[PDB]
Amino acid sequence: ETFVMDDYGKKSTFASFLPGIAGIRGIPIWCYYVNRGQCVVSFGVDNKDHAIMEFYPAHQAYQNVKTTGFRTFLKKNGTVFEPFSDENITHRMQIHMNGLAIEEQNRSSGMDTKVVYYTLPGENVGALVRVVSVTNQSGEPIELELIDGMPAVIPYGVSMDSMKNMGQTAKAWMQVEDLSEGLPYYRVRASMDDTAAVRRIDGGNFSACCEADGRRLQPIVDPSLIFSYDLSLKRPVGFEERPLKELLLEEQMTQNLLPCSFYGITRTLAPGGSVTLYELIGQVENKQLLKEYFAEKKDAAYFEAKKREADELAEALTDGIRTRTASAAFDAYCRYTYMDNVLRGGYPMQLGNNKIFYVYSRKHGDLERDYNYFSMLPEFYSQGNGNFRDVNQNRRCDTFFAPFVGRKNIQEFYSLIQLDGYNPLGVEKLTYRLSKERAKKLLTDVKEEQRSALIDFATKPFTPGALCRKFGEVFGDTWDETLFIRVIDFAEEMVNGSFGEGYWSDHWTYNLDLILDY
Amino acid sequence: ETFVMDDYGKKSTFASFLPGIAGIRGIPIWCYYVNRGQCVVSFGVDNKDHAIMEFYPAHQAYQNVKTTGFRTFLKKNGTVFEPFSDENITHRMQIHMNGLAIEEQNRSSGMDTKVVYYTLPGENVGALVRVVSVTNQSGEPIELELIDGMPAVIPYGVSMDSMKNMGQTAKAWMQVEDLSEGLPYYRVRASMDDTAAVRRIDGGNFSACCEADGRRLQPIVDPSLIFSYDLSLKRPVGFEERPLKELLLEEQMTQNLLPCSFYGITRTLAPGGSVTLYELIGQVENKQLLKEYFAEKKDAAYFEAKKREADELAEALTDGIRTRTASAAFDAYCRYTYMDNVLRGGYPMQLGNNKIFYVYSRKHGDLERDYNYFSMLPEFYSQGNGNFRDVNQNRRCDTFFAPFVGRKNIQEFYSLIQLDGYNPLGVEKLTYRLSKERAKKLLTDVKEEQRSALIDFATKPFTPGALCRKFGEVFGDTWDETLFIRVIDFAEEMVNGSFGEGYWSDHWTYNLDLILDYLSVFPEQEKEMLYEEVYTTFLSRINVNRRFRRYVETENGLRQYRALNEASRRADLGEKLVRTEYGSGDVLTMTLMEKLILLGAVKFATLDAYGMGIEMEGGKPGWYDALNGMPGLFGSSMAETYELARMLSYTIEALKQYPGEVALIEELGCFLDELNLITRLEHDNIMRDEELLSFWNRINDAKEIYRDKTYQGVSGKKMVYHTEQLAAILEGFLEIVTCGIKKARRISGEICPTYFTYEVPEYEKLKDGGIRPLKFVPQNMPYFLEGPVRYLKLPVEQGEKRALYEAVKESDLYDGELSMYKVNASLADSSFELGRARAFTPGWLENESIWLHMEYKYLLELLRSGLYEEFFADFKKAAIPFQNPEIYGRSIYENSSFIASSRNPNPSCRGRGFVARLSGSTIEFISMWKEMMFGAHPFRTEQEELVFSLAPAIPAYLIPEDGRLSAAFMSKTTVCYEFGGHRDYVPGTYRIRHMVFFYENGSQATVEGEKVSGKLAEDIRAGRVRKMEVAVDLEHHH
Ligand SMILES: OC[C@H]1O[C@@H](O[C@@H]2[C@@H](O)[C@H](O[C@@H]3[C@@H](O)[C@H](O[C@@H]4[C@@H](O)[C@H](O[C@@H]5[C@@H](O)[C@H](O)O[C@H](CO)[C@H]5O)O[C@H](CO)[C@H]4O)O[C@H](CO)[C@H]3O)O[C@H](CO)[C@H]2O)[C@H](O)[C@@H](O)[C@@H]1O
Ligand SMILES: OC[C@H]1O[C@@H](O[C@@H]2[C@@H](O)[C@H](O[C@@H]3[C@@H](O)[C@H](O[C@@H]4[C@@H](O)[C@H](O[C@@H]5[C@@H](O)[C@H](O)O[C@H](CO)[C@H]5O)O[C@H](CO)[C@H]4O)O[C@H](CO)[C@H]3O)O[C@H](CO)[C@H]2O)[C@H](O)[C@@H](O)[C@@H]1O
């Protein structure tokens, strides 16, 4: 069920990505990786211009993975080693359905390193969980000092074109705050553009690291404390010159720089011992939500439960094509193909009692499809728009797997045919609108102050995720789902369709297949 | 003359660039470098999207210099070393005037490496020459295999945005051809864009490497043959695994890849031996030109001659400011400053017999000014366009160095002033056009086939470089320059000027400096300059809205956002001049006096309600560009008021000096009469009142009437006047301005203010839709250094200026530790809508930093006022050449935009320059040097007779032990002094004994005393004297 590659550093290069599914009640993110270094290039939330790690095409991703990617440094008795930096040392790679784990077995230094990547499922905050473990395989106790983190974090509010063109001047707006509390907040001082909503940048990027006991660690945001005069990020000269304890006591730059995030601990490892770290890198919209999320302590059990939930999510999503044949590769390929088809087209689900909804759909884009401008919705019940041909083809055999769909697809794709035989290119995401009298009749078990806001929001067109977020923000934390179900059920479907760019001559031929499949 | 830095890898980072001058007959290129790796980041020809090396900002340049920059690999008996990769190994760096050389001394491997960079001068093809030498310092013979080249070459036809966004997909169009011939050609297979001219990409990038013997080498274009699976370009795994000889025999990729260029040789070096390589990386437009260029073999003598020519080009360009003082750093800084000023403004030269041309000008841009879009012309007689303010300031002292220029600058920069007082932002490059009959008459000694093409090309507008290129392409290689000279001479000058983006409120104040600089050399031409009818008027493009319609009400209160009406937008291609008969007659001509009167009248009657500042109604701020939101808050500036007062005083003096008759257009005369009536009516009310509204309404109504009447067209009818009425009107205006300045000084405090910001609490809505204010509430602003700098120009007594200097020294504008003058006080207590300046950290960019331009302006104003001792004391400490190179973190011969002050939160960055060089302080330093070496007025006029005298003022720390100082006067005559002691020779404390003149024909002359008048002065001003000997206090003692 898993694919294992040995010595991926010396093999041919390829680019892949995580599925980025956070479930019904999660915030999805996008992450791409290559088979070089620590196998992470860029990731972020929503579309571009909101990326925690700078986005690169495939060539630049291959060229700059080992410098701007995740970095891990070790020191064993005055000598500094760097895992996943030398291809001669044996290393391995595993590709799960919804995960990625790599490891290295360095027989010279007698230490093993394992890194696990997965997306945090089913939480109000979208982030990328990262677990790092180091095991001592020598025969004597050792004194180990570890540093691990990301050397370049793009502050919130910096556009991609700005970063790639006017980067030197863009450093005037960069800052990092809240270092004493252990939750650094990366955002711009003021809006880059010369328009309204000045000093309105409230969202930011956060990073938190903790051990098994659950206590957070003091971060390092000044790259000059680790590399000193070396601006190529190739040698940790500062780490070699000075002990880790001294570095944490030194004053750090917080403004007019490109901030980083490194966490360090000091430990003495007995033979057979191990050290584990847990990290969370994500993006929020205000400090209040971030503070509320960390109102309860996070520990190892929480992270392992989240990892199991993330695996089970994909394993249950792709449970409708399970087969058994002579070769397991065939059924593994079948499951992967079904997952990809669901990811591109959209998984059908039954919403309310008479509505049909599609989730996980997105405008695809990757390190090789760099000409596209991908976009995702960072809220509950994630969905996205797409082209006509792709969505029409992907939903060809949707009735067979989900009998309750019926003839929704046929009506949807035959109502987009104009009187002259041509059809619009775009198929926008679903939305719902509620009338006046029905809205006033349904809302009879709520306070007037909440009722006014709810009836003002529900009348305008909305998406289910936005409705759920508004429900939460209005009712606090002790609401009921029956009201949401009734509002969705009594809502009215809103028509969809965008003209796009032009008229093709082959988009009309993919409907007889739907008719025959039904 | 050269700056040497040791172990530049471990020092603080900085960014610089080569001057990129290829001479008159060369193709210039642009190249930037940093103090990391091999010190080359990106270079190319023309603007961006045509770069051989990918362009990066400063941060990315620092981060990726060691990977995408030039790479050198060595192998000594199975072990691979890489020079300029480890900072522990000793290395050195030298910065020449027009070159760059680095070296490394590796005592472990016992090998030395030296790399030299320079631009190829005076050739039809622009390229970057690179010389690499390796010397064996061991005691035994070694077997050396060398590989050197560039790992990433951008094929011709790939845009920058494409490379930085869609690079993975863009590799489908990349290819490399002509590998057997040894001249690889990098270009795209077809045009990237989906438009016409398909398969028309003919230009490309080429690289050629040869040894001393002149034979070319087989290149390597596949990076996978050197790095193998290592895609990070960090380890040459392929080179380590296999010998060099085997690599050259293997098949290489030529399509669907990012090509590189590596050259390799194999040699056995005896102890003390050396190996040298020469390279050429450039860009052409067709293969035929490249083949023709390499029709003759290139060898070591050719390259060394080219290097000597490149050095001599700069050494001769900067030969007009040569001096000799106690410290060589001072004269080196003077030469560098003059070179930078020439590079930004343009070197004057005499083209043909009656034309004046400027070369080497460009739209500047560098790794730190990444927001600009630089552009250069890749042809002979290189030139470029620029902004109005920068070009106007850079050519302030151009007449002194080049007497033959005359009054070209004054006419050029006064013909760009529109009838409403504003001027276009852009000043495009010069161009020429030839008529029909003259073209057919001149071309009578050429074949018909060539004549048709020549007369078809010459009629259309053209540049001299394009004309020379067409001449060459038509005539082959055996033409004559007399035809080109005659065509240039008989060509007609074409008008220039582009509207740009918007209207500022400070571009008009940099012309009195030009007038005074011209008059300081030709004191007897004043009347002729004033009463010459040659100046034209630029045609306005956008007219400003009325004051009532300029106000928009928002939630925060009443604002001033709308400033221009789009309904009256003009076309930027129809006409660039103003004609009589409402646009259907001949070209309108006005005298200089009329222009001065119009400027004074228009800049008057624009004062704010309180009558202190001048409204910035053009939608843009003044000199301080960071506060780009001030015009939206009813902003006003006192610097414009001071400049207006100075200009009006000068105009009054000029009118009272030469009586006569002055003619003005009808509208200007009516405006002057109405303004005189308003002033005569409300002078009494102005004196005793705080807030003035009726005066503001009357003057704004008159100005609006005049502006709307004159915008749509002006008749050629002209009204005669006299001098007494104009003198009286200008005296009244000057009195009003002086009263306003006094009121502003009373209100502000101990230091003269610089800006004001009003807020109207109550307003009345009109029936037509406009908004009529009822009252204004002034608000104070933090102190700025520009205020006192402008105020020092006014003619006040010495005591007030000394008190102002003491107050400024005691105030917060004077940094304590650095002993320099900041730009402004704390802005943290002002409104948040001021602009981008409020979003910057204090002590960084234009926020409480040390701006060299304003500091040098203040020092120059101190010098001109007569505070010689204070000027010397402050210049000893605030000058760039006197700074500590370690703290400054840069060569002391180069300027910077600003220096971080003590307010910077990071202590380690306090006292370091930024934004490379080419700031506005170069012209300030040039003026300071001129007035310090020769005095304010070398030439005077009395009873229509020229008088020549010198009044130098040199501080004690510049006179050498032998007491001899030399400087270049008029860039042709050398003046040598002889001081008899070590003391400050301020004027009034010394007397000149005698002077000796050396004519160019060998005759001598000795004039006793200090005053020389007559034919000797005429010869001196005409450059007929080669050397002078001036003695102060007789001979020199111990
Ligand atoms: O055969 C292989 C595949 O070919 C594909 O066709 C490609 C075609 O789609 C591509 O078109 C280019 C446009 O995508 C490109 O779009 C531009 C935007 O990128 C730009 O905005 C970005 C902005 O998103 C970012 O934040 O900032 C950037 C810097 O400011 C900014 O550039 O806006 C532009 C203006 O709106 C917009 O045009 O524009 C290019 C130039 O016009 C287009 O060329 O072109 C490729 C090369 O020709 C094609 O290969 C097919 O679609 C695939 O099916 C094939 O598999
Ligand atoms: O106080 C410090 C200094 O501040 C400066 O003000 C800065 C201001 O000039 C800057 O304006 C930005 C524009 O320069 C920028 O221009 C855009 C172009 O870059 C773009 O074309 C490029 C193209 O050249 C390249 O080949 O491809 C690129 C990718 O496709 C493409 O982006 O075209 C745009 C549309 O025409 C054009 O706007 O645009 C930015 C966004 O509008 C502007 O912000 O902004 C800075 C930050 O606000 C200012 O600091 C002063 O000028 C200096 O005097 C000060 O020293």
mmCIF file of N, CA and C in Angstrom, chain B residues 487-534:
data_model
loop_
_atom_site.group_PDB
_atom_site.id
_atom_site.type_symbol
_atom_site.label_atom_id
_atom_site.label_comp_id
_atom_site.label_asym_id
_atom_site.label_seq_id
_atom_site.Cartn_x
_atom_site.Cartn_y
_atom_site.Cartn_z
ATOM 1 N N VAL B 487 25.676 65.781 -42.764
ATOM 2 C CA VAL B 487 24.287 65.409 -42.506
ATOM 3 C C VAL B 487 23.880 65.812 -41.095
ATOM 4 N N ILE B 488 24.754 65.576 -40.115
ATOM 5 C CA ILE B 488 24.448 65.981 -38.745
ATOM 6 C C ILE B 488 24.339 67.498 -38.646
ATOM 7 N N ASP B 489 25.254 68.219 -39.299
ATOM 8 C CA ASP B 489 25.255 69.676 -39.219
ATOM 9 C C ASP B 489 23.987 70.268 -39.822
ATOM 10 N N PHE B 490 23.561 69.760 -40.977
ATOM 11 C CA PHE B 490 22.385 70.297 -41.649
ATOM 12 C C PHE B 490 21.077 69.728 -41.117
ATOM 13 N N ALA B 491 21.129 68.771 -40.196
ATOM 14 C CA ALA B 491 19.911 68.241 -39.608
ATOM 15 C C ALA B 491 19.268 69.277 -38.692
ATOM 16 N N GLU B 492 17.971 69.107 -38.462
ATOM 17 C CA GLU B 492 17.186 70.030 -37.654
ATOM 18 C C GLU B 492 16.891 69.405 -36.299
ATOM 19 N N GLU B 493 17.108 70.177 -35.237
ATOM 20 C CA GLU B 493 16.800 69.709 -33.893
ATOM 21 C C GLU B 493 15.304 69.462 -33.746
ATOM 22 N N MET B 494 14.958 68.367 -33.078
ATOM 23 C CA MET B 494 13.572 67.977 -32.863
ATOM 24 C C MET B 494 13.214 68.189 -31.399
ATOM 25 N N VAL B 495 12.030 68.759 -31.155
ATOM 26 C CA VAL B 495 11.617 69.045 -29.787
ATOM 27 C C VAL B 495 11.438 67.745 -29.006
ATOM 28 N N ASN B 496 11.500 67.863 -27.682
ATOM 29 C CA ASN B 496 11.438 66.711 -26.797
ATOM 30 C C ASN B 496 10.590 67.050 -25.580
ATOM 31 N N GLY B 497 10.091 66.006 -24.924
ATOM 32 C CA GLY B 497 9.285 66.177 -23.732
ATOM 33 C C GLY B 497 8.097 65.241 -23.658
ATOM 34 N N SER B 498 7.970 64.530 -22.542
ATOM 35 C CA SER B 498 6.865 63.614 -22.302
ATOM 36 C C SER B 498 6.180 63.985 -20.996
ATOM 37 N N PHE B 499 4.845 63.913 -20.992
ATOM 38 C CA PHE B 499 4.080 64.358 -19.830
ATOM 39 C C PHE B 499 4.433 63.555 -18.584
ATOM 40 N N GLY B 500 4.539 62.241 -18.715
ATOM 41 C CA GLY B 500 4.899 61.399 -17.586
ATOM 42 C C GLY B 500 3.672 60.931 -16.829
ATOM 43 N N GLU B 501 3.669 61.152 -15.514
ATOM 44 C CA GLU B 501 2.623 60.640 -14.639
ATOM 45 C C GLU B 501 1.779 61.749 -14.024
ATOM 46 N N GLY B 502 2.399 62.709 -13.344
ATOM 47 C CA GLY B 502 1.639 63.732 -12.651
ATOM 48 C C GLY B 502 2.373 65.045 -12.476
ATOM 49 N N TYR B 503 1.817 65.934 -11.657
ATOM 50 C CA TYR B 503 2.379 67.259 -11.421
ATOM 51 C C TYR B 503 2.907 67.340 -9.995
ATOM 52 N N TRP B 504 4.183 67.688 -9.859
ATOM 53 C CA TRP B 504 4.779 67.968 -8.564
ATOM 54 C C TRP B 504 4.709 69.467 -8.281
ATOM 55 N N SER B 505 5.302 69.884 -7.161
ATOM 56 C CA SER B 505 5.297 71.290 -6.771
ATOM 57 C C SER B 505 6.695 71.799 -6.438
ATOM 58 N N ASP B 506 7.740 71.103 -6.888
ATOM 59 C CA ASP B 506 9.103 71.523 -6.597
ATOM 60 C C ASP B 506 10.043 71.439 -7.791
ATOM 61 N N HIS B 507 9.564 71.045 -8.970
ATOM 62 C CA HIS B 507 10.442 70.917 -10.126
ATOM 63 C C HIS B 507 10.822 72.260 -10.734
ATOM 64 N N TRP B 508 10.098 73.328 -10.406
ATOM 65 C CA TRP B 508 10.321 74.630 -11.018
ATOM 66 C C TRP B 508 11.381 75.461 -10.310
ATOM 67 N N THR B 509 11.875 75.016 -9.158
ATOM 68 C CA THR B 509 12.767 75.831 -8.347
ATOM 69 C C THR B 509 14.242 75.639 -8.678
ATOM 70 N N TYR B 510 14.583 74.719 -9.581
ATOM 71 C CA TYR B 510 15.974 74.415 -9.892
ATOM 72 C C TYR B 510 16.449 75.094 -11.173
ATOM 73 N N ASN B 511 15.972 76.309 -11.444
ATOM 74 C CA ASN B 511 16.393 77.066 -12.616
ATOM 75 C C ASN B 511 17.158 78.334 -12.276
ATOM 76 N N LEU B 512 16.851 78.966 -11.141
ATOM 77 C CA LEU B 512 17.647 80.104 -10.703
ATOM 78 C C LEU B 512 19.086 79.692 -10.436
ATOM 79 N N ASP B 513 19.299 78.451 -9.992
ATOM 80 C CA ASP B 513 20.658 77.946 -9.838
ATOM 81 C C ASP B 513 21.380 77.899 -11.178
ATOM 82 N N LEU B 514 20.698 77.430 -12.227
ATOM 83 C CA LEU B 514 21.299 77.428 -13.558
ATOM 84 C C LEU B 514 21.628 78.842 -14.012
ATOM 85 N N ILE B 515 20.705 79.779 -13.786
ATOM 86 C CA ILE B 515 20.921 81.156 -14.224
ATOM 87 C C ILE B 515 22.126 81.760 -13.509
ATOM 88 N N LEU B 516 22.207 81.564 -12.190
ATOM 89 C CA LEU B 516 23.323 82.112 -11.427
ATOM 90 C C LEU B 516 24.641 81.454 -11.816
ATOM 91 N N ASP B 517 24.629 80.139 -12.053
ATOM 92 C CA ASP B 517 25.850 79.457 -12.466
ATOM 93 C C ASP B 517 26.333 79.965 -13.817
ATOM 94 N N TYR B 518 25.409 80.205 -14.750
ATOM 95 C CA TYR B 518 25.812 80.778 -16.030
ATOM 96 C C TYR B 518 26.359 82.189 -15.858
ATOM 97 N N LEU B 519 25.704 83.008 -15.031
ATOM 98 C CA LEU B 519 26.140 84.390 -14.874
ATOM 99 C C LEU B 519 27.454 84.503 -14.114
ATOM 100 N N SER B 520 27.813 83.491 -13.323
ATOM 101 C CA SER B 520 29.091 83.530 -12.622
ATOM 102 C C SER B 520 30.282 83.384 -13.559
ATOM 103 N N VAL B 521 30.056 83.016 -14.818
ATOM 104 C CA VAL B 521 31.123 82.845 -15.791
ATOM 105 C C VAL B 521 31.109 83.947 -16.843
ATOM 106 N N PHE B 522 29.922 84.410 -17.241
ATOM 107 C CA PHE B 522 29.763 85.445 -18.261
ATOM 108 C C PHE B 522 28.967 86.594 -17.654
ATOM 109 N N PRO B 523 29.604 87.428 -16.828
ATOM 110 C CA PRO B 523 28.862 88.516 -16.172
ATOM 111 C C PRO B 523 28.384 89.601 -17.121
ATOM 112 N N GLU B 524 28.964 89.718 -18.313
ATOM 113 C CA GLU B 524 28.601 90.783 -19.240
ATOM 114 C C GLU B 524 27.521 90.372 -20.232
ATOM 115 N N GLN B 525 27.029 89.137 -20.158
ATOM 116 C CA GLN B 525 25.988 88.649 -21.051
ATOM 117 C C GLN B 525 24.607 88.675 -20.410
ATOM 118 N N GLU B 526 24.467 89.334 -19.258
ATOM 119 C CA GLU B 526 23.214 89.279 -18.511
ATOM 120 C C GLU B 526 22.069 89.910 -19.293
ATOM 121 N N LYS B 527 22.289 91.108 -19.839
ATOM 122 C CA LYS B 527 21.224 91.788 -20.570
ATOM 123 C C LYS B 527 20.838 91.018 -21.825
ATOM 124 N N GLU B 528 21.829 90.484 -22.543
ATOM 125 C CA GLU B 528 21.537 89.700 -23.738
ATOM 126 C C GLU B 528 20.746 88.446 -23.394
ATOM 127 N N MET B 529 21.099 87.782 -22.290
ATOM 128 C CA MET B 529 20.346 86.607 -21.866
ATOM 129 C C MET B 529 18.918 86.974 -21.483
ATOM 130 N N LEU B 530 18.744 88.092 -20.775
ATOM 131 C CA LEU B 530 17.415 88.472 -20.307
ATOM 132 C C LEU B 530 16.513 88.899 -21.458
ATOM 133 N N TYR B 531 17.070 89.567 -22.465
ATOM 134 C CA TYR B 531 16.285 90.141 -23.553
ATOM 135 C C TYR B 531 16.499 89.398 -24.870
ATOM 136 N N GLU B 532 16.587 88.074 -24.806
ATOM 137 C CA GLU B 532 16.687 87.229 -25.989
ATOM 138 C C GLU B 532 15.365 86.501 -26.189
ATOM 139 N N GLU B 533 14.794 86.622 -27.388
ATOM 140 C CA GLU B 533 13.485 86.043 -27.686
ATOM 141 C C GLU B 533 13.681 84.746 -28.468
ATOM 142 N N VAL B 534 13.999 83.681 -27.733
ATOM 143 C CA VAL B 534 14.128 82.349 -28.320
ATOM 144 C C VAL B 534 13.306 81.293 -27.595
#
